[PDB]
Design an enzyme around this catalytic site. Structure first.
Site, mmCIF file in Angstrom:
data_model
loop_
_atom_site.group_PDB
_atom_site.id
_atom_site.type_symbol
_atom_site.label_atom_id
_atom_site.label_comp_id
_atom_site.label_asym_id
_atom_site.label_seq_id
_atom_site.Cartn_x
_atom_site.Cartn_y
_atom_site.Cartn_z
ATOM 1 N N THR A 266 -8.212 -7.942 8.609
ATOM 2 C CA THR A 266 -7.279 -6.872 8.274
ATOM 3 C C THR A 266 -6.001 -7.485 7.677
ATOM 4 O O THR A 266 -5.503 -7.067 6.632
ATOM 5 C CB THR A 266 -7.121 -5.903 9.463
ATOM 6 N N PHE A 391 0.187 1.349 7.733
ATOM 7 C CA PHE A 391 0.287 0.917 9.143
ATOM 8 C C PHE A 391 0.165 2.096 10.115
ATOM 9 O O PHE A 391 0.496 2.010 11.307
ATOM 10 C CB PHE A 391 1.579 0.123 9.390
ATOM 11 N N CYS A 398 0.747 0.796 13.775
ATOM 12 C CA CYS A 398 0.439 -0.603 13.988
ATOM 13 C C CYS A 398 1.571 -1.323 14.721
ATOM 14 O O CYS A 398 2.664 -1.455 14.174
ATOM 15 C CB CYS A 398 0.250 -1.304 12.660
#
Ligand code: HEM
Ligand code: I8F
EC number: 1.14.14.1
Length: 453
Positions: A266, A391, A398
């Site tokens: 990622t 995000f 995130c």
């Protein structure tokens, strides 16, 4: 209004549409055909895929919608447990872990991770300095070596030593095969067909590998007493201010597995895409290299110097716009509600946010949405609310955002300082899909500028 739905396959409904090597890109194509919202059915499942800022801004209202575990996340939960990424917001461990770990992932905390991020970055630069003239770089392969090693070292003072290997460390073997099984299960018609028995046996074996290494790491640290500048230290000693409780050793293991998943492809994907766009856009490469040369005046980059790389940051944001490497997230309706004035939803109804499509909303970005233009991000506050979501959203965004961007900015800055890059093969973008996205087979040559470390 009646919601559009893609092509069906009799009683399997829309499910065989996901029987492809590239499901995100297929869904993107469906969105282009069908527009800002479409229904997707499978045996026992209904979701709605959202692609427009108009509808996603509503989806992102935490009073109305909460994070859902997609089928993908439910399968990842078999080894990531009730870690932060695979827990429901209402589970006790979510908010506990969230309160404990937030300060360790802040911008201020990056000052303390910097030194070990430079350790791995220098390893990457030294590898490329040592290539012979004939030779090329396997970009996603080396970026993944870097990002995994950085989270290992910064996260629990463990060296995977990825630059010393062609064969991935046995933990990473197991983690990658488990992530593959989880994604391959989504597509499957008749999951308990005997044909997939071997798959299941291997899945259990890989979970055990991961659990065994990580539980050993945790137990070794507890039985040593040693205090590091790392997340494992903070998780072993920290208390949630709200409950007054620490994380237990089983949850700590789940958080570590979670961070190793994120720090794998990622994060490495963002770097691989950014270098792809740089070598396809030489005037952007020129600007980014000029900035690196001007700013990174010392052999060892400082924290402050990495913060000074504004243009490098703009490049990374524009790569996140075009190819966000964690390309979807899921929500559920907390109560009955009407989406965009047109789409009634029942409590429990699911949405999916298709982030690459959100990021191509022409009503937000203009018609030239496929162009690589870092200047879009010259000023962050020009961007409408909820237009840019690489995000995620809200309290379930995130936690690793500042970590990923510091690492990426440092590494991309050092790469641009130290080498000229050549797209020697005229690489044709081919995006391979795992849990994340990456430019498969992307190779470059790196001509050293011969600047000392
Ligand atoms: C560019 C790199 C990365 C991107 C694009 C990214 C993207 C995301 C996204 C979109 C979410 C939300 C997931 C959802 O709603 O289901 C998320 C959650 C999360 N990410 Fe990342 N991520 C990155 C790197 C990292 C790193 C390096 C770490 C850890 C070291 C990390 C740890 C997490 C965690 C723990 C969550 C769950 C947060 C919560 O729900 O409490 N990520 N990430
Ligand atoms: O997991 C799901 O229900 C649905 C697919 C699905 C499966 C069965 C029935 C309907 C829809 N998933 C998705 O639509 C998306 C896009 C395609 C790939 C899988 N996917 C995902 O979100 C993958 C999950 C995360 C993992 C790390 C962050 C980035 C992705």
């Amino acid at each position: 209004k009646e919601m559009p739905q893609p092509k069906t396959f009799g009683e399997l409904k829309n499910l065989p549409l996901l029987n492809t090597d590239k499901p995100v890109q297929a869904l993107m194509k469906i969105a282009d055909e069908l527009g800002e919202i479409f229904k997707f059915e499978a045996p026992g499942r209904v979701t709605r895929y959202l692609s427009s800022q108009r509808l996603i801004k509503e989806a992102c209202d935490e009073s109305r919608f909460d994070k859902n575990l997609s089928q993908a996340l439910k399968f990842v939960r078999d080894f990531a447990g009730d870690g932060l990424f695979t827990s429901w917001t209402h589970e006790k461990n979510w908010k506990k872990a969230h309160n404990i770990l937030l300060p360790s992932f802040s911008q201020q905390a990056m000052k303390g991770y910097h030194a070990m991020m430079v350790d791995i970055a220098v390893q990457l630069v030294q590898k490329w300095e040592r290539l012979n003239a004939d030779e090329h770089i396997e970009v996603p392969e080396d970026m993944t070596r870097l990002t995994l090693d950085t989270i290992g070292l910064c996260g629990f003072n463990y060296r995977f030593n990825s630059f010393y290997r062609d064969q991935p460390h046995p933990f990473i073997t197991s983690m990658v095969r488990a992530l593959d099984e989880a994604m391959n299960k989504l597509q499957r018609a008749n999951p308990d067909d005997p044909a997939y028995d071997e798959n299941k046996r291997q899945f259990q074996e890989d979970i055990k590998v991961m659990n065994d290494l990580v539980d050993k790491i945790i137990a070794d640290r507890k039985a040593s007493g040693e205090q590091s500048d790392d997340l494992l230290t903070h998780m072993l000693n920290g208390k949630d201010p709200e409950t007054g409780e620490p994380l237990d050793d089983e949850n700590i293991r789940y958080q570590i597995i979670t961070f190793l998943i994120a720090g794998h492809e990622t994060t490495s994907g963002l770097l691989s895409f950014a270098l792809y766009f740089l070598v396809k856009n030489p005037h952007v490469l020129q600007k980014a290299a000029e900035e690196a040369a001007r700013v990174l005046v010392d052999p060892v980059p400082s924290y402050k110097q990495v913060k000074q790389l504004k243009y490098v940051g703009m490049v990374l944001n524009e790569a996140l716009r075009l190819w966000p490497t964690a390309p979807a997230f899921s929500l559920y309706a907390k109560e009955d509600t009407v989406l965009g004035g047109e789409y009634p939803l029942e409590k429990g109804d699911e949405l999916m946010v298709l982030i690459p499509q959100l990021h191509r909303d022409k009503t937000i970005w203009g018609d030239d949405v496929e162009e690589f233009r870092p200047e879009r991000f010259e000023n962050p506050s020009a961007i409408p609310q909820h237009a840019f979501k690489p995000f995620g959203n809200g309290q379930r965004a995130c936690i690793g955002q500042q970590f990923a961007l510091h690492e990426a900015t440092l590494v991309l800055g050092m790469m641009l300082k130290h080498f000229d890059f050549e797209d020697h093969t005229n690489y044709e973008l081919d995006i391979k899909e795992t849990l994340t996205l990456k430019p498969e087979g992307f190779v470059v040559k790196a001509k050293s500028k011969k600047i000392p470390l």
